[PDB]
Design a protein around this ligand. Structure first.
Ligand code: 6R8
Ligand code: 6R8
Ligand code: ZN
Ligand code: ZN
Lengths: 425, 422
């Protein structure tokens, strides 16, 4: 495996699909699809799949935020392979609170130039998606012989947004309604390749995460004309002032956390990092009396073998060490996984890659193995899964794909399927 | 120590609140899909008793309720978990001969007993640990670790499929797993359900299959071809009738073949055809070219859903029928790992309160869906334990005496386990 030169026919068929590949990627990439509003992108993919005869279904918690699942049905007796990429993209209509430059052309558009396709939404993640969409089209139209099904899974809400506090429900949900939902409601297979920009480097371990809301307490609040001064920062009745000290302690803890929990796996080396993604205390429209509490929100990545409570307790000890009183409240926990029994997919992939790209695969860097990918939900559910695709990673952060690379990735995908899907499950 | 004795007879002094909480909770209409009001009651109950509840939910009218009894520090934390939804809706006339019988929809205190399917499943076991927590708090029990109080929506096996999508039809995806994934974590979790004081720490997974038989061509009744052998009938309903018989045979043997013994219980994974539809009753002058059944196939923890799908496809091809066999639900079952500390804390409290070692649970009770699966899936070793016979069995009432024992077992388990070191 794979096949004979059933492969040759499919490779040429893909050669002839270069314009479709670019067109699909630009059209998809041009659709505004920040997490929370992936619907329009979903609709595009549904119709694309319908046109091409993959019998898509919308599989979603919400009628405007859904996954799209289609299939290329095999003849029987082979392993099934899922291809998966996500529908949502990074920058909403205006993320001025995160980024200082929340509106550049590259951040909200996509176009074909030279032999490149530009746009963050192409890098992450409409480009890799176009690649396996085309791969499947070629397989279908070439009449490739496949015993197993190919499952086509475009998912919403991959990006790490989460409800918390007063931000609840439809507008703020993500991973809970995405890949895991799609799989749990029918999109199952023997194996799954998650297409993301990895520069043709396969990973099959990823991090989990625990998000902590840390609320430091102080008080009592006083009207500004009555505030006691001077007072040592850690004793300040202003929770914001205490939080400032806590923040630098947590930064120290974080510097060492990633070192202490670094851990090497067959699938990659996890370097689990920590960042303080938000802070808020008091409200901007009533500032005449300082707040008795102040909260930060921490993103703490987990290697697959770390219980979230171990991390919560470590943060609680940083707080205690400072003599502060705080609530350390988790509001998100997802496990990361190393794929188990990945070998058949890893092998079929390695063989396809060598043929198409012409060299052995390189091992990915740590960040690419220490993040969230939808390989976690697949592996969680017993579907061995790895991530692989063309392009320098979005978090790199790349701003374009080479059309040559995309075409290579499409071929790798088609070859992988023609091999793996003809193995007996 | 000697808090135990104090708590024990804080609890016997609470028989009134236990009964009232169970009857009031059980009296709230809360079929899966409409569990909101039950959630509100639980939230308000938690708030009055100082457990600082939070609504944790995908929808503002279908949510989990998570509360907490905070420990002094340095101990293991324990979740108590029960679900807010109940089995019967007043409209389930499609399922039950008399879907409006009082036992399905009401709860009441009579003599020694509390009647109501909604108390058996699951307001009764919920009241048990609600009261246990209240007793632990008020008696000022010393606890190093937290007790996490987790009332979840959407535990019951309802699922979207076909045109039935979204809010009204979701369940487990927005229930316990959602609650845990969004903060309700602990070192251990006790899922309070009716188990007749027998602990289970293995449960089944499941794959739901939509099986659609194709036939045709459809004809206006005055043109229908007869006689035609069943398997050749242009009427998909007629073909499906023969397939149903074959799948019943497969199901008979399936549970034998995949029966499997675990430390946490013996799993006997069963199969049932839960629904059928072909054609529509308001247009019956031309028979349908397709007909669908919907299969509930339980999985032991070590069975891949695709193996099962293939087996069903094999039954179809042996009859020589054309059909789509389509999975529309798959969830894994788990045997807990590292359950020993909870198992032990439970066993000690149980022997003391109930006065005899625990027995292994009956196979159905560890061959079903329970929210131990999400906890174990997420690395929180979890077992299920509580008073009374299983609703699915199904039992109709709880003895208030049993409810009290359960509450005491819960309280004692916490005082032990939450004072061990994490
Ligand atoms: N009498 C009817 O109009 C009613 C129903 C059908 N039909 O089953 O398509 C045909 C008729 C016909 O012969 O015209
Ligand atoms: N897991 C359930 O809650 C859901 C469904 C039923 N039931 O269909 O009777 C019973 C259960 C039980 O009593 O454990
Ligand atoms: Zn991505
Ligand atoms: Zn139940």
């Amino acid at each position: 495996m794979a096949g004979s030169n059933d492969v040759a026919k499919v490779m040429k068929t893909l050669d002839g699909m270069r314009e479709g590949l670019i067109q699909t990627a630009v059209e998809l990439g041009s659709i505004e699809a920040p997490t929370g509003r992936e619907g329009a992108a979903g609709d595009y993919v549904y119709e694309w799949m319908a046109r091409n005869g993959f019998g898509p279904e919308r599989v979603g918690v919400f009628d405007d935020r859904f996954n799209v699942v289609g299939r290329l049905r095999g003849t029987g007796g082979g392993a099934s392979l899922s291809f998966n990429s996500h529908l949502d993209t990074i920058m909403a209509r205006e993320d001025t609170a995160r980024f200082a430059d929340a509106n550049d052309r590259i951040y909200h558009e996509a176009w074909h130039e030279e032999g490149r396709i530009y746009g963050y939404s192409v890098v992450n993640c409409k480009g890799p998606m176009a690649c396996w969409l085309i791969a499947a089209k070629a397989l279908k139209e070439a009449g490739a012989a496949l015993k197993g099904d190919v499952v086509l899974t475009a998912v919403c809400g991959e990006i790490d947004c989460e409800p918390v506090d007063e931000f609840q429900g439809h507008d703020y949900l993500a991973e809970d309604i995405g890949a895991r939902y799609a799989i749990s409601h029918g999109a199952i297979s023997d194996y799954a390749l998650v297409a993301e920009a990895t520069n043709f480097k396969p990973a099959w371990v990823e991090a989990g995460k625990v998000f902590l809301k840390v609320t430091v307490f102080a008080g009592p609040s006083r009207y500004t004309p009555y505030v006691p001064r001077p007072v040592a920062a850690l004793d300040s009745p202003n929770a914001i002032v205490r939080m400032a000290k806590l923040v630098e302690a947590l930064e120290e803890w974080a510097d060492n956390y990633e070192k202490r929990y670094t851990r090497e796996y067959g699938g990659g080396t996890v370097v689990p990092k920590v960042a303080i993604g938000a802070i808020r205390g008091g409200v901007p429209y009533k500032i005449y009396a300082f707040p008795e509490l102040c909260s930060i929100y921490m993103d703490i990545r987990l290697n697959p073998d770390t219980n979230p409570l171990v991390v919560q307790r470590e943060v609680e000890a940083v707080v205690s060490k400072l003599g502060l009183k705080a609530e350390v409240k988790p509001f998100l926990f997802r496990r990361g996984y190393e794929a188990q029994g990945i070998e058949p997919l890893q092998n079929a992939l390695e063989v396809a890659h060598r043929e198409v790209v012409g060299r052995p695969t390189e091992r990915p860097g740590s960040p690419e193995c220490s993040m969230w990918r939808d390989t976690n939900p697949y592996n969680e559910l017993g579907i061995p899964s790895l991530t692989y695709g063309c392009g320098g990673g979005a978090g790199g952060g790349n701003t374009y794909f080479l059309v040559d690379d995309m075409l290579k990735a499409a071929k790798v995908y088609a070859m992988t399927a023609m091999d793996l899907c003809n193995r007996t499950p």
